[PDB]
């Protein structure tokens, strides 16, 4: 159905310990495909997915070029902001930039993004209309005014609606077997004795892609949201994800509970039951 491409950049100053560390990563949906690490020995944008390895030196040199440029920009950005906020040269600080685009089920442009955060707090963001800016603090105002004057938005709009969506489609095609796949979750349930009248029923979802999933428990078909421990979807490390939901069941009441699993790769949602 729908798809997205995202680039995440993190610059952290090492006052007195060299130039700031810069990490850049690229994603298509839930699959990372590239990365750059300033502390790394190669100093090149590197492939992280199989489908991007055979792009060619023009692609790699071009991206390496541009990512290095992102590095140099963020380096100056750190200084700008320590200044904007009156901070000392001693402290370590963080700049985070994220830009990308969403395409719908029909593969046409849907949403564009471009925003920054300073020390984990929103700094500036390109609005949905891709014409205006949401400026956080007093400091961000300088930036907003500057960017409005220079007509940065229109330049960003062109990329998000053009190049971003165009290359996303290309990547989708290039890596059709991975990106255009869906792995349904492998489900199972575990029972663990707690006391003499209580047991934990845990519902598992393993080896699924993409990461979106709805795992819930019910008692007599009634919601049990507030009574369910539900962990954060986690990466198995091989490209798939995992997730579990559990309920503490009064002994003899197992039959009353049903686990429900919803996922893109399932032909129909699952209703699991301990019996």
């Amino acid at each position: 159905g729908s798809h997205s491409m995202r680039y995440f950049f993190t610059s952290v100053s090492r006052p007195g310990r060299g130039e700031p560390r810069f990490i850049a990563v690229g994603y298509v949906d839930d699959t990372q495909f590239v990365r750059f690490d300033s502390d790394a020995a190669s100093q090149r944008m590197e492939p992280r997915a199989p489908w991007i390895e055979q792009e060619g030196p023009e692609y790699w040199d071009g991206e390496t070029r541009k990512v290095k440029a992102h590095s140099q920009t963020h380096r100056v950005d750190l200084g700008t902001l320590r200044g904007y906020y009156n901070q000392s040269e001693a402290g370590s600080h963080t700049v985070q930039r994220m830009y990308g685009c969403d395409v719908g089920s029909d593969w046409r442009f849907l949403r564009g993004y471009h925003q920054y955060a300073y020390d984990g707090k929103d700094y500036i963001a390109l609005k949905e209309d891709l014409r205006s800016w949401t400026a956080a603090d007093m400091a961000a105002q300088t930036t907003k005014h500057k960017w409005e004057a220079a007509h940065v938005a229109e330049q960003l709009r062109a990329y998000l609606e053009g190049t971003c969506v165009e290359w996303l489609r290309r990547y989708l095609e290039n890596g059709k077997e991975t990106l255009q796949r869906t792995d349904a979750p492998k489900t199972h349930m575990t029972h663990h004795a707690v006391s003499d009248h209580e047991a934990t029923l845990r519902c598992w979802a393993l080896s699924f892609y993409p990461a979106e999933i709805t795992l819930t428990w019910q008692r007599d078909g009634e919601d049990q949201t507030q009574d369910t421990e539900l962990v954060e979807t986690r990466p198995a490390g091989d490209g798939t994800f995992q997730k579990w939901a559990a309920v503490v069941v009064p002994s003899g009441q197992e039959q009353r509970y049903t686990c429900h699993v919803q996922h893109e790769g399932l032909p129909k949602p699952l209703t699991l039951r301990w019996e």
Binding site: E63, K66, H70, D77, Y84, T143, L156, Y159, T163, C164
Partner: peptide, 10 residues
């Protein structure tokens, strides 16, 4: 593919 629009906060 990465953005190519040169951008500095300040």
């Amino acid at each position: 593919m990465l953005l190519s629009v040169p951008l500095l906060l300040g």
